[PDB]
């Protein structure tokens, strides 16, 4: 079964600005994105130093970019602390709230779409250059699910049935037609070095072939 929800009235209403406001500088999302898997690496990292068992699930920490052509989308896998239902449905969204209305506040005095990550916000970023998005997520502690959003006031959350990762996030990005740019090997690397050069765990660009 999939369970279909409501975003939160200011979320949707963030998503709204994010895909509708005229902003030329979209290449910022991926940084976002890279900033987020940094932090859940960070997190499985920390809590494995108390209990080693928590990486018995799998010890590799990293990040991979998958860009596909044929598919025109752009995958951000990492091996961090994941993410469980209650996160995915609720409890991340809860968090958000204030930031989500401080940065639109900001937004309406002036400030730009490019500080989204200061508010703690960043992944809603991602609507910049994706008409869909979905996230594919194993926790220790839950089952592996797939959150996934076309925007448009609502997101599913599904059991994930397909190949199983043992711990970590999967973000695949539905390009939009006129963003493919962002699957070009010089453009991903050139992104990479500007905004994300000093992130404390490996990165590697996979080649199409
Ligand atoms: O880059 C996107 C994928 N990842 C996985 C990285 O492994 C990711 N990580 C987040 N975090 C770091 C790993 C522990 C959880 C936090 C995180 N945090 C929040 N929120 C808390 C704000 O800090 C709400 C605001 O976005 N929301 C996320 N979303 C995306 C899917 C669920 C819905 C909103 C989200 N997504
Ligand atoms: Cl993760
Ligand atoms: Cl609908
Ligand atoms: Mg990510
Ligand atoms: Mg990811």
Redesign the pocket.
Known sequence: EVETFAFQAEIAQLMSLIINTFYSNKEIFLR??IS??S??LD?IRYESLTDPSKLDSGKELHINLIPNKQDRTLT?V?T????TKA??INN??T??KS?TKAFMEALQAGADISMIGQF?????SAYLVAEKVT?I?KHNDDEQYA?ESSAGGSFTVRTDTGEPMGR??K?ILHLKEDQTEYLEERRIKEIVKKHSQFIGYPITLFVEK
Request: no cysteine.
């Open positions: 976002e994105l987020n898997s932090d859940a997190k951000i990492d961090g602390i994941g993410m996160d995915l991340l969204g968090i958000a930031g703690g916000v960043g992944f809603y996230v997520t959150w970590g996030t973000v």
